[PDB]
Symmetry: none
Subunit: 267 residues, 6 copies
């Protein structure tokens, strides 16, 4: 038995990136660079255990150096725990196999050679993990972990209806995605943000659109909204920045700043 | 089936470099520097699919150690930054500038190496790819890509007469090139531009002349015009600059400035 | 015969780290970095000899320089060498049973940040600065080398008093509670120090309870947290290199702020 | 078949260095820093006598040896070749900037240092290009257009070699040449010797037996510009300093 | 025949370090750093000591560049009741040095080592285990330099006539060494002095208590050498730089001589006028 | 046959350093740092051909081995093969050690072990440079007429060397001079007493060469830079020539 996904607290940005990829695997996978390592392996297992069967969904790990495990990985999840030194070309093929049919998930180690700029831009979204800063939230996690370690089944049962409610929303979102439309004016202003961010190519334009539709589908709507784009654009474009080294500005803050201007958002 | 060449939008400078080399392979090949994406590989496949049957053969040569007998074809070196055997690169340049005849195309990695003035001056033209900055154009490109991915054959058919029209223009330009002449005054003012740019050698003089003749041939003319030279001279000379490091001036902008002065464009 | 633990003078911070681990080994071990005129080899030997009999005495096992892979105390004299592979395996035996103790050399390879965070506490040894104490250590040391048995007898009842306190602390540890407000303020200190993960939260809580148990109390006190929090978090700092501040001094500074500890200015 | 030597335009300084070495190989070879590989074969094809053979060193008595990249092939191999020269064959070397600038102890041992500057006259650049393609299209009609000029220069080379033993330099000139070497702080007396051997070879080339101030003028930059010991505090061109000191010592208005 | 120890001029600080180790070998050896009469002084000290028996002359053992435990019978045993000179202890780093410091920290000996600057400073963990740090400064008195040279040629020409000229001084110094060894057990250091010695070590931020011990063993040995049984402030003054200057942990912001820093702090703590 | 020693012009400092070592080999050899190409190997051959009895010059190559006396040993590049082979040669010096080196420098610890440091500067007088070259080709064309032109001067110099060697035991230096020599070494911060000894041995050898048995202040003057300039411990904050510093301190101490 694995820690229930709906009980993981304090990782909202990473749970969003994983949920949107389950809804639209053509987003291109998630690169998880949480320099603060905490709840990385167990979150991805919780999400696999949460998905419905169609045979149960299978999660595959990227260990060893097999040249070629994409066999048992179709219509599933593939986790490469340390893709910071995993060959050099095998990474290229997996990023293609995810953008045309599985959920690519990658993790890295800080100070071991930060993702080479040619292989990180091909990742759909870039989710960073920062350890929870709210004190009473940190206490709740610790109190939850020992409470789970002592009595797994009373814990998993406590979240049983919340897991099923989220399980149905994933299915509904997958079913509704074909009807989800984004207005032309929004689709254009998304590209304006990609241009003003000096994104290398059009992949950033493509992922933001696929992500915004997948989020709107998740929330049971068929028209992409300005707020829908707001919640996915940092995940999609912050690792696609081409900023001058003379700038001390946060990448995620640069995308939010440019997004708010182009769309005219007052916070 | 491959994305049609005549549908590629926003890469005009590179499509020009590729078309001129297809018309006169003795130009010396194309070095493609710029955005990694923007389908550099797929444009060259599209151009191969467009050429007439004399089908033309497209060569990969990816990370190898000595695939070079496809004469009157195209050779794409995706990462000629990792041909640490410079001797492989050097022979491919001279053979491209003669019949040993093929269209050399190479791509490289910025900030990794190579690009050494000895390994860059021998490329005929230097085509730079800048990703489109106009928002509605980016949307149009994206809307075209999946439209091709969902229905390849209806997309290729929409461009079928334009593909055949461009195919006839390539053959015509190849056939007309022998009579294309350049005025002596232009030929001298071109050399004045190469000298005033302090280009290393006379190869820049040679490529600019061959490019201007090929462009006029493409457009069904037999007299090279100042506008013909205008459209090729940056492709030919910007990677042949010997500018002082004290200059914050764009290389391509330097070539345009000196061309305008020597020829007197106002 | 071994030098008696209750006779060691001038290592209070390190003796505290060892005693609390003996009381609660799930704290995660002690990393001993510092000076050489102490004898981390004989203080740990003294602590094994001080513990109660296990049925023979508790076994102290030493790991020499050339050491290949292969309820007591394990002393790893040089955990700088013996690459991450061997070091990783030992940390598993700890955490959630033996007291891991490691020592290191300065300038022989800085604390590997990923393998140092997994040590429970970080005790630094500073050689005694009080002149009359330095004389006392030397006079005691030669006095022990000439007549071990007369020396150990001078400290035999004090060894038994400390031995009973250790057992009492272990027996009482299950009833030891920490107030919710303290538990949250401990996590607030961990957050304000930007600690990597929640491991710092857990050992500080386990350490404060073990100290309160050592002193025969069942309620963790602000002062109880004060005496263990530097041992627990100073090697868990992520401070900017632009700061010339001592790590242990940074933990005390943030601890006093979060808990609001100030000196009464008496007339 | 090779492009004729007498048709090469715009390389006068390098053609002078090569002709003088062919006349007196004891000068010590040429360091060449637009296609010098064919210029040296053009010179090989031009010499008399079986025909002289030009040898390439990619990894030869009484001929020509061209070391294309004397920056690589470490001092060990380079040292050995310089012995064959000096006080007999024509050593020719070229070098690459940024590839291991020729060690200062290994560059001084070359007789002359000829620099190639690409032609700046527009109508000349056009003429060179038309000459290359005209040669590629019809080599033999090209070589024939230059056949009598090739034979004329071939006779001058033979005569110059035959006349060199009688060529003399005035004592006052020979001393002022040494003053130029001393005022330049040259490493040793090799500059005094090469400038003397070069001035005599040039005078012999022109059918004369007395070295002239003008003869020295035309050879002294080739001989001394790579032998300078100037302070790095000088933004002054090396070749211009040699002319400047030459003009002072000899008194050229 | 070897140059007589009592004739060596201008090495006073090193002669003091060597004599005290001969008097109390538990001091821990001498590290000789400085200008480059080093190999010849130690043999003279070996030649000066009184002739010993097999097991209840003193033997000098050297060590060339090649060690690799080709000493552990070998060479470690020939140093029994003798002296071991390590000519270049800045090379053969790590293990070989650690083993020798252990063998002198079945044969006990006076460890003496010399090193080369710029070719490696002995790793600070293995230099602190040397008892004392004696530096050799070449004599600056001109008329003294002439005497040293003139003594060298005078000895090279007539060894035996030279040794006789110093023979009674050798016997007097030999008797003082034996007496000092015999008197060492009674030599006491006052508690107030013993504490102020530790205060100097602390104010110098010395690594450990080894400096406290060496200064005390050295002060007693010097007082014993001079036929006294009470350590004096001047006794401590003459050994404290030998004992602590290689034990400094000084900030790199200080252009102060290490040996000179010890003198200043010693004068401060003890109140020397 | 080799170019005669007495015909070499413009190398007076190196000819002085070599002659004194031939007279008193215990001086410790010569380090020749001539930043100019002037035929260092052939001067040493010229000096060997000049000595009586015949003589023998060994020339060590770059590739030293693992193993000559009463002769001359020339180490053309004492930079290579320096770890131990250079160390071994300085120990064996009975023969006249001669070494040359190229800048871009021997171990500051292995250069102090050389007796004297003679620098070669290329002749700056124009009419002299011409004469050297004219002498070289004239010798290459007619060796025996050239060597005969210098034959008696070679014999005159040869006899002076024999006389100096034969007279050396009687050569004395005043005590006041000998102390002032040591005072110069002290103010130069010389490493050890090796500089004091060579300056004394060199001054005696020079006085013996000139047929005298009492060292003169000028005798010390002409050798002290050869002996002490490579034994300096001067601050890097000084833009002063090392050889010029020795002259400065010598002039003060002796009062010249």
């Amino acid at each position: 038995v694995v820690f229930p996904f709906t009980a993981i607290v304090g990782q909202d940005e990473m749970k969003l990136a994983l949920l949107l990829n389950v809804i639209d695997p053509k987003i291109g996978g998630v690169m998880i660079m949480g320099d603060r390592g905490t709840g990385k392996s167990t979150t991805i297992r919780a999400l696999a255990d949460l998905l419905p069967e169609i045979k149960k969904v299978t999660m595959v790990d990227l260990p060893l150096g097999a040249t070629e495990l994409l066999a048992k990985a179709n219509r599933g999840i593939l986790y490469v725990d340390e893709v910071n030194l995993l060959d050099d070309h095998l990474v290229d093929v997996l990023l293609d196999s995810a953008a045309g049919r599985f959920v690519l998930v990658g993790s890295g180690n800080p100070e071991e050679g930060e993702l080479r700029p040619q292989l990180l831009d091909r990742f759909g979204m870039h989710a960073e993990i920062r350890t929870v800063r709210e004190p009473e939230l940190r206490v709740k996690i610790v109190e939850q972990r020992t409470e789970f370690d002592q009595n797994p089944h009373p814990f998993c049962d406590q979240y049983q209806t919340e897991q099923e409610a989220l399980q149905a929303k994933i299915v509904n979102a997958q079913n509704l995605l074909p009807q989800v439309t984004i207005d032309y004016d929004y689709r254009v202003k998304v590209s304006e943000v990609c241009a003003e961010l000096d994104v290398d190519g059009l992949r950033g334009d493509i992922v933001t659109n696929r992500a915004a539709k997948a989020l709107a589908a998740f929330e049971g709507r068929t028209e992409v909204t300005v707020d829908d784009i707001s919640r996915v654009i940092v995940l999609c474009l912050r690792h696609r920045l081409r900023k001058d080294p003379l700038e001390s500005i946060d990448s995620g803050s640069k995308v939010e700043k440019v997004f708010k201007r182009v769309f005219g958002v007052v916070d």
